[PDB]
Amino acid sequence: ENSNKRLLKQWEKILRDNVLKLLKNDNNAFYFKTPVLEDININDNIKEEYRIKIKKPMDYITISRNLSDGIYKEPIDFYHDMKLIYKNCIDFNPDIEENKYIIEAAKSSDMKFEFLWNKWKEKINNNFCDLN
């Protein structure tokens, strides 16, 4: 919520505006916006199951916060976290009719993210100095 005066690096700006911005508010974003373990809409029994089973829970708001705070040391650390959101959904939720929308939303967003990462990886690598 607090205003961040920290100046984002050019590679961090590309991930924020050209990759994350187009995914964080799309038609398949709804279930991946806020964290699972602190969401009031999910019952306590599923939240207990998620905390015990999921190694690292990930969502769009955590990524927006990490990108703002300068948590990622390399652009690939953002890639791994974005991929983690969709990978956690497929691994936790069983492939059944009641989970049809959520499994499709995770699969489609992963494909959409991979396109956006492939389209921008050239400029991302060019704006990132690994030697400094």
Interface residues toward ligand R78, by CB under 6 A: 31, 36, 39, 41-42, 46, 50, 89, 92-93, 99, 102
Alpha helices in the chain (DSSP H): 10-14, 44-53, 60-69, 75-92, 100-126
Select the binding partner of residue 132 from its own copies, ligand R78, none (C-beta < 5 to 8 A, by kind): none
Which of the stretches 9-17, 24-32, 55-63, 87-95 binds its own copies when contact is defined by CB under 8 A? 24-32
Among 14, 15, 28, 89, binds its own copies (CB under 8 A): 28
| Least distance in angstroms from the C-beta of 132 to its own copies | 33
Q: Which is nearer to its own copies, 66 or 99 (CB)?
A: 99
Binding of its own copies at residue 127 (CB under 8 A)?
no
Q: Is residue 80 within 8 Å of 57, Cβ to Cβ? A: no
Q: Which is nearer to its own copies, 9 or 112 (CB)?
A: 112
What's the CA gap between 108 and 93, in Å, rounded?
16
Q: Is residue 107 within 8 Å of 83, Cβ to Cβ? A: no
Binding of its own copies at residue 4 (CB under 8 A)?
no
What's the CA gap between 8 and 4, in Å, rounded?
10
Q: What is the torsion angle, in degrees rounded to the nearest 10, for the CA atoms of residue 85, residue 87, residue 88 and residue 93? A: 120
